[PDB]
Amino acid sequence: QQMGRGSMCDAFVGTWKLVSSENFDDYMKEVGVGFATRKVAGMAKPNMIISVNGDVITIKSESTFKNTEISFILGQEFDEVTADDRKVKSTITLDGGVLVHVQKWDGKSTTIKRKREDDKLVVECVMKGVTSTRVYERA
């Protein structure tokens, strides 16, 4: 083995903590999340851990609501069971500086975009006209 060089993906790597959320309940309603799940999910203040090993990116979310972890290669679709228990087909691509995560299920689609802004990692979740913005800071 030899040491890998860096990538643009490196600005995402680290441990992040949710600090603010806007319009998340409305986004979840658009997605179809039930009442009790929305309530509990909406309280959570997760930590998100993003790491890279070769071509594989891992995004772990640790919270009091659910823990989740996904591992993927950019452009390569995978199965995901989401925190709210949807079984979706996901594809994550890096488009410029933005991680773009598309989830497809039951003829529906939502997109989650992650981008660095100043020292924050801003997450935009979009489901037809409804957007939620979640902001993470370094833990």
UniProtKB/Swiss-Prot annotation:
Q: Which family does it belong to?
A: Belongs to the calycin superfamily. Fatty-acid binding protein (FABP) family.
Q: Which GO terms describe its biological process?
A: brown fat cell differentiation; cellular response to lithium ion; cellular response to tumor necrosis factor; cholesterol homeostasis; fatty acid transport; long-chain fatty acid transport; negative regulation of DNA-templated transcription; positive regulation of cold-induced thermogenesis
Q: Which GO terms describe its cellular component?
A: cytoplasm; cytosol; extracellular exosome; lipid droplet; nucleus
Fetch the Pfam families from UniProt.
Answer: Lipocalin
Q: What does this protein do?
A: Lipid transport protein in adipocytes. Binds both long chain fatty acids and retinoic acid. Delivers long-chain fatty acids and retinoic acid to their cognate receptors in the nucleus.
Gene that this sequence comes from: FABP4
Which named protein is this?
Fatty acid-binding protein, adipocyte
List residues modified as N-acetylcysteine.
9
